[PDB]
């Protein structure tokens, strides 16, 4: 019923082979819409969704100058880290940030996100009360007391309750017909063969959006729970997604096993079987 | 007082080059450039973080070019100087945290571009004794100083009682007035007051000097005309105590 | 735009003083910032915040808290405080846009004694320079008007080793027509002023 907006940062020191690289990507739901990369050759926020292309040039200046600013800010932050952790200069490290907001279905705030991470480890986190922080290690505590006294808390909250949800509602309406229109997965079940006194069925989910989906699937049943075999929800490439459950069952059983196929695109949710 | 700039002032002909400088407090991350005509607030020019030029407004003609190579000092260069470039060129910086947006400004280089230099005049300073009526009435003595007529209006006035500077009892005109205000190159004029006890003025060994620092032409500059050269000088007028 | 201030503005030493600003859009992630430029130098910071309340050494700052129309207090106003004040909105990262802005004049209490003396020297210039002085701060000095004769605006000297303060204004010219009896005749002078001729 709801929606989300998430910007992601990736700062990556790399010494000898550069000054550090800084990348920013912006999603709405599972739709990538804005990209920034300080490599550039002449850098600026670039439009990757069609509904964002239709914006003022003054929108793009704001957004570039933000990430151009953040280029330097993080090159600093990567080095302030080295001091906190006493780390060698030759080492290559990574800072990762994610911030954003959830709406949803009426059109308010639900919760806020603002989360930083160092070398793939939780560093600092903005709590769900949007006024206090979580310090992971003794190094983050520096960087907490910095923001505590600088009253950084409120300027997020003001933004996350304001411009975050404001802009999101704008993005949604502007590209409603791709973003607010869930697509059902085209489902089928294939036979594989096997053993022969033992088979593998395979419940296919294809060509759907968003990535959220559940495939897991029966006999009487529950079932399975456990066999399984589930596979990582992979991207098709056309802004649609894919997935299967197996499973492995005895041969000639066999129409016992029923599949099971929850998506927000559907009403039902469906129930499939081997056909043939 | 952190931020320092070089020079305090400059004066040039028309199609000429000139470069300023700003040395901010080391361990200042960001450095800003502003211009200020007398009457308005500072207008934004450019803004650097470390060694990179992040933002710059449409006020920056191509002729202007800011640069900050090592990310410490910054040079602001003007290519073909115009009469419209004439203004105070401020330069501020920010600490590297900070938190809040606390910009620390410098003294400012003072540019004045001219058609030709024949307009550049020094000041002529004279001081006027206080009135006998004022003495015998108010039991005080108001000395006055008029420094005139000088161009451009970049001059600084100061009093010196018994060869020692004084700020007590001093009121100087904040900004000076034009002599022939309907002219584009009108020469200026500045007034000031030093007030002391009647019995201090009535002591004839007490000395009073009204001093005027004038910032003018270079020794370098090409002067042509019959009169003296208007070089950055200090004009002054004396006055002594009267027994009366 | 964003940033309506009274172009100027007086106050008395020293209560008030009470220095408004209208920012009537500002979305809620934008800070309200106040800077001050004391004539000869060249701005400093005074106060922000946020959309709040708030209150430091220089400065209080009261926001509407509906975000609407903030007010700098400068709590016991003094002569040193007379300066140009700028009310600017900062949204983070962006450039600052100092407006025009508000010129605050702070004028003292007295014990008054209006008078127009004629000074002397020069003895070169020359010669006569009238000094209208010792008047109460409810007096306003006026303009020339004929620009053969010059008249500076009023200004306040601080003795200061006595009490002691005094509004003073200077006027001069280079003629015979000109005398101190007729220097400020298109300025509304207190109808009891001292006028001597030491000639």
């Amino acid at each position: 019923g709801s929606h989300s907006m998430r910007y992601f940062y990736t700062a990556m020191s790399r010494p000898g082979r550069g000054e550090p690289r800084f990348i920013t990507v912006g999603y709405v739901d599972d739709t990538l819409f804005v990209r920034f990369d300080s490599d550039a050759t002449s850098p600026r926020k670039e439009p990757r969704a069609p509904w964002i292309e239709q914006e003022g040039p003054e929108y793009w200046d704001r957004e570039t100058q933000i990430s151009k600013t953040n280029t330097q800010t993080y090159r600093e932050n990567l080095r302030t880290a080295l001091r906190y952790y006493n780390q060698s200069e030759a080492g290559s490290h990574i800072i990762q940030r994610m911030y954003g907001c959830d709406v949803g279905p009426d059109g308010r705030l639900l919760r806020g996100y603002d989360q930083y991470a160092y070398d793939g480890k939780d560093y600092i986190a903005l709590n769900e009360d949007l006024s206090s922080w979580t310090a992971a290690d003794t190094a983050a505590q520096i960087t907490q007391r910095k923001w505590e006294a600088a009253r950084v808390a409120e300027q997020d909250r003001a933004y996350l309750e304001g411009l975050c949800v404001e802009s999101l509602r704008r993005y949604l309406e502007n590209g409603k017909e791709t973003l607010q229109r869930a697509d059902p997965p085209k489902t089928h079940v294939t036979h594989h063969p096997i053993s022969d006194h033992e088979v593998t069925l395979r419940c296919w989910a294809l060509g759907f959006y968003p990535a959220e989906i559940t495939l897991t699937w029966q006999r009487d049943g529950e079932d399975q729970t456990q066999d399984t075999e589930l596979v990582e929800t992979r991207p098709a490439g056309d802004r649609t997604f894919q997935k299967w459950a197996a499973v492995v069952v005895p041969s000639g059983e066999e129409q016992r096993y029923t599949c099971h196929v929850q998506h927000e695109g559907l009403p039902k949710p469906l129930t499939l079987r081997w056909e043939p | 007082t952190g931020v320092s700039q070089n020079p305090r002032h400059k004066i040039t002909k028309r199609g000429q080059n000139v470069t300023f400088r700003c040395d901010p407090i080391s361990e200042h991350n960001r450095l800003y450039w502003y211009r200020q005509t007398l009457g308005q607030g500072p207008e934004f020019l450019t803004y650097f973080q470390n060694e990179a030029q992040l933002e710059k407004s449409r006020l920056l003609s191509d002729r202007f070019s800011a640069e900050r190579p090592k990310g410490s000092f910054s040079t602001l260069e003007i290519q073909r100087t115009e009469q419209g470039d004439s203004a105070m060129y401020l330069c501020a910086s920010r600490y590297r945290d900070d938190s809040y947006n606390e910009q620390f400004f410098g003294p400012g280089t003072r540019l004045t571009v001219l058609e030709d230099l024949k307009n550049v005049f020094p000041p002529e300073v004279a001081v006027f004794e206080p009135s006998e009526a004022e003495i015998s009435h108010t039991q005080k003595a108001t000395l006055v100083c008029l420094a005139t007529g000088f161009y451009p209006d970049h001059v600084e006035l100061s009093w010196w009682v018994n060869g020692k500077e004084v700020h007590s009892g001093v009121c100087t005109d904040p900004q000076p007035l034009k002599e022939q205000p309907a002219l584009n190159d009108s020469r200026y004029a500045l007034s000031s007051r030093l007030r002391v006890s009647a019995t201090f003025w009535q002591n004839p060994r007490n000395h009073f000097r009204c001093q005027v620092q004038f910032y003018g032409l270079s020794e370098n500059d090409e002067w042509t005309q019959d009169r003296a050269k208007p070089v950055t000088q200090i004009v002054s007028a004396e006055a002594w105590g009267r027994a009366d | 735009a964003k940033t309506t201030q009274p172009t100027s503005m007086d106050c008395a030493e020293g209560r008030a003083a009470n220095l408004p600003c209208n920012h009537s859009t500002i979305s809620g992630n934008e800070y309200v910032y106040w800077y001050r430029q004391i004539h000869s130098q060249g701005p400093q910071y005074i106060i922000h915040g946020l959309k709040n309340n708030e209150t430091n050494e220089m400065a209080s700052l009261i926001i509407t808290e509906d975000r609407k129309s903030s007010t700098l207090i400068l709590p016991h106003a003094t002569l040193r405080d007379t300066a140009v004040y700028y009310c600017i909105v900062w949204g983070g990262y962006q450039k600052v846009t100092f407006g025009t802005g508000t010129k605050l004049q702070v004028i003292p209490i007295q014990n008054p004694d209006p008078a127009v003396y004629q000074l002397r020297d020069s003895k070169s210039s020359d010669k006569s320079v009238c000094l209208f002085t010792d008047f109460d701060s409810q007096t306003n000095v006026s303009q020339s008007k004929d620009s053969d004769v010059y008249i500076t605006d009023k200004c306040v000297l601080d003795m200061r080793s006595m009490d002691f303060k005094s509004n003073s204004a200077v006027a001069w010219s280079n003629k015979s027509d000109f005398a101190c009896a007729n220097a400020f005749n298109n300025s509304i002078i207190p109808e009891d002023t001292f006028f001597p001729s030491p000639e």
Binding site: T73, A150, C164 | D97 | -
Partner: peptide, 10 residues
């Protein structure tokens, strides 16, 4: 849109 503080730093 994005939000830049800016003075938020490690």
């Amino acid at each position: 849109e994005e939000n830049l503080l800016d003075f938020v730093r490690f």
